[PDB]
Amino acid sequence: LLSLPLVGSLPFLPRHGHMHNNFFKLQKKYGPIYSVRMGTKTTVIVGHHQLAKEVLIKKGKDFSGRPQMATLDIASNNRKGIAFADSGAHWQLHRRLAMATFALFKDGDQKLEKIICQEISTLCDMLATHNGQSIDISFPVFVAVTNVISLICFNTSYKNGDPELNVIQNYNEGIIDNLSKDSLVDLVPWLKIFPNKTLEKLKSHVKIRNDLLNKILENYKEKFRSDSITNMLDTLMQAKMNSDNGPDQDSELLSDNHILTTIGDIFGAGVETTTSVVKWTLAFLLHNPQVKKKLYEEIDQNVGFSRTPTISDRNRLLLLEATIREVLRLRPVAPMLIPHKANVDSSIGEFAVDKGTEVIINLWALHHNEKEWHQPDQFMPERFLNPAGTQLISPSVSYLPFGAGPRSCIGEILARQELFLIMAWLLQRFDLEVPDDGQLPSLEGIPKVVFLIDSFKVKIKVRQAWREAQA
């Protein structure tokens, strides 16, 4: 009695549980490196820190391209910008200029810390008007970190109640929704098998996004002074200037669509991800009041109420720095990075990997590795401190929240500051507690282009100690 023909097989149900954890459950059967084939496209999944560091660092440039996706093609205006562009001059140029702009914000009145502490102060007043109420702090934080990103790109910020802030939130919410139904890792190309409006809806929100950035770029051309370089849009237009003296090879790379999409990748990435981490950290502090207490005690002991937090306070506020590290471990912004692609025939762990092969780092597996992490499913900021509690450690090498190699986060500095500063300023001012209905946020989360958390509310009272310190 024979056996049936078999035209296809998959090791686990599609659209059942989260992708990254399904790949990770799978290492028990098939190991830390294994592949899957859809027609002609082939995808490798890496889930051990050593092989991941080979893809990202040692052979970093070999695996530094990005794969063509129909949904990502739109959000990037056909693979322009940075995050979703293939390895090339465009990507190399724009990524370089983008980083050069962050250099401008080391010193002065445009000192990055000053810009942040500024928009954080407005945030804290805004939140104090809700003393005694339970609220969803998504939008107030969204506006804070939009203004920072907007000051670095434009030297502009949105005044309060501006209706554009609600427009931006809308198309951001729309891009996130149609860009993926899970992480950017669909085994099955569902949107080509069945008819659907997914791409049509996406174009709408990107169209709004693109038209809006376009207005801003036209208005700025009058205002541009070659002698005044203080934001990203300057760095980009200066580049276009120095190229067209006829034009250089760099000229075709700095058209207004290439400049537009670059800003849109800075904005799109920076804002929604920084906001998500803030929501994720409060989520964890509401589940772990014991950690919350030691964080209040630490910040009262080392900063007080005579002044506001400063980057300088990073050296004394250690448990806070560890808590941010432990949230980015348990809940990586990008539990599977962005897909890398093999630019050239190569090898991972001495296995052959053909040109054009989608390679995926399963960061979720690196951060939950039983052997590399003690009690990996637990929230223990202690694990990033010596047993004393007096300086920070790197307890494991299987920890790359911002990735590594040629394709790592370019806004790592900015995020590490914002996340520290925001969280300091709030813990100083505010008591943060479970609302009166008694509901706690769900830490399960929601994988999209960003690893998001279900919306949740928090009761917020100004702190006893902070009041009495005003006389």
Ligand X SMILES: CC(C)[C@](O)(c1ccc2cc(OC(F)F)c(OC(F)F)cc2c1)c1c[nH]nn1
Q: Which of 69, 148, 259, 338 binds ligand X (CB under 6 A)?
A: 338
Q: For residues 76 and 428, which CB has a smaller minimum distance to ligand X in the complex?
A: 76
Q: Which residue has the tokens 């300091």?
A: 424
* 386 labeled part of a ligand binding site: no
Residue 175 binding target from ligand X, ligand HEM, none, CB below 5 to 8 Å by type? ligand X
Q: Which of 348, 450, 452, 460 binds ligand X (CB under 6 A)?
A: 450
Of 352, 409, 340, whose CA–CA distance to 64 is shortest? 340
Minimum gap (Å) between residue 267 Cβ and ligand X: 7
CA geometry: angle at 150 spanning 93 and 405, to 5°? 35
Minimum gap (Å) between residue 454 Cβ and ligand HEM: 19
Of 398, 339, 393, 412, whose CA–CA distance to 365 is shortest? 398
Minimum gap (Å) between residue 423 Cβ and ligand X: 18
Residue 95 binding target from ligand HEM, ligand X, none, CB below 5 to 8 Å by type? ligand HEM
Burial class (CB in 10 A: 0-12, 13-18, 19+), 360: buried
Torsional sign, CA 22, 69, 410, 136:
negative
Considering only residues 183-222, where is the footprint of ligand X by CB under 6 A? none
**Residue 9 has what DSSP assignment?**
-
Residue 408 binding target from ligand X, ligand HEM, none, CB below 5 to 8 Å by type? ligand HEM
* 172 labeled part of a ligand binding site: yes
DSSP assignment of 78-130 equals TT-SSTTSPSSHHHHHHHHHHHHHHHTTSSSTT-HHHHHHHHHHHHHHHHHTT
Query: Could you tell me if 303 and 317 are in contact, meaning their C-beta atoms sit under 8 angstroms apart?
Result: yes
* By CB under 6 A, residue 262 contacts ligand X: no
**Residue 431 has what DSSP assignment?**
E
Q: For residues 276 and 323, which CB has a smaller minimum distance to ligand X in the complex?
A: 276
* By CB under 6 A, residue 236 contacts ligand X: no
Burial class (CB in 10 A: 0-12, 13-18, 19+), 444: exposed
Total number of residues that touch ligand X (CB under 6 A): 18
* By CB under 6 A, residue 180 contacts ligand X: no
* By CB under 6 A, residue 76 contacts ligand X: yes
Q: Which stretch binds ligand X (CB under 6 A): 27-35, 265-273, 345-353, 376-384?
A: 265-273
354 vs 345: CA distance, rounded Å: 5
Q: How many alpha carbons lie under 13 Å from residue 240 in its C-beta half-sphere?
A: 17
Site mask, ligand X, residues 279-298, x = CB under 6 A? Answer: --------------------
Minimum gap (Å) between residue 91 Cβ and ligand X: 13
Q: What is the dihedral of CA 394, 441, 378, 50, to 10 degrees?
A: -50
Residue 178 binding target from ligand HEM, ligand X, none, CB below 5 to 8 Å by type? none
* By CB under 6 A, residue 334 contacts ligand X: yes
Burial class (CB in 10 A: 0-12, 13-18, 19+), 128: middle
420 vs 309: CA distance, rounded Å: 9
* By CB under 6 A, residue 62 contacts ligand X: no
* By CB under 6 A, residue 276 contacts ligand X: no
* By CB under 6 A, residue 151 contacts ligand X: no
232 vs 461: CA distance, rounded Å: 38
* By CB under 6 A, residue 449 contacts ligand X: yes
Minimum gap (Å) between residue 223 Cβ and ligand HEM: 23
Burial class (CB in 10 A: 0-12, 13-18, 19+), 140: middle
Largest CA distance in the chain: 90
* By CB under 6 A, residue 418 contacts ligand X: no
Site mask, ligand X, residues 93-132, x = CB under 6 A? Answer: ----------------------------------------
Q: For residues 269 and 318, which CB has a smaller minimum distance to ligand HEM in the complex?
A: 269
* By CB under 6 A, residue 172 contacts ligand X: yes
Separation of first and last alpha carbons in the chain = 90
Q: For residues 69 and 449, which CB has a smaller minimum distance to ligand X in the complex?
A: 449
Q: Which stretch binds ligand X (CB under 6 A): 268-276, 286-294, 304-312, 461-469?
A: 268-276
Please report, as a single letter, which amino acid is at residue 182: D
Residue ranges in contact with ligand HEM by CB under 6 A: 82-83, 95, 265-266, 269-270, 273-274, 277, 328, 333-334, 337-338, 401-403, 407-411, 414-415, 419
DSSP assignment of 250-305 equals TSGGGSHHHHHHHHHHHHHHHHHHHHHHHHHHHHHHHH-HHHHHHHHHHHHHHT-S
Of 125, 112, 67, whose CA–CA distance to 339 is shortest? 67
Q: For residues 145 and 198, which CB has a smaller minimum distance to ligand HEM in the complex?
A: 145
Minimum gap (Å) between residue 149 Cβ and ligand X: 11
Residues lying near ligand X in the complex (CB under 6 A) = 75-76, 83, 172, 175-176, 264-265, 268-269, 272-273, 333-334, 338, 409, 449-450
The binding site comprises: 172, 409
Point out the annotated binding site for substrate. Answer: 172
Residue ranges for the known binding site for heme are 409
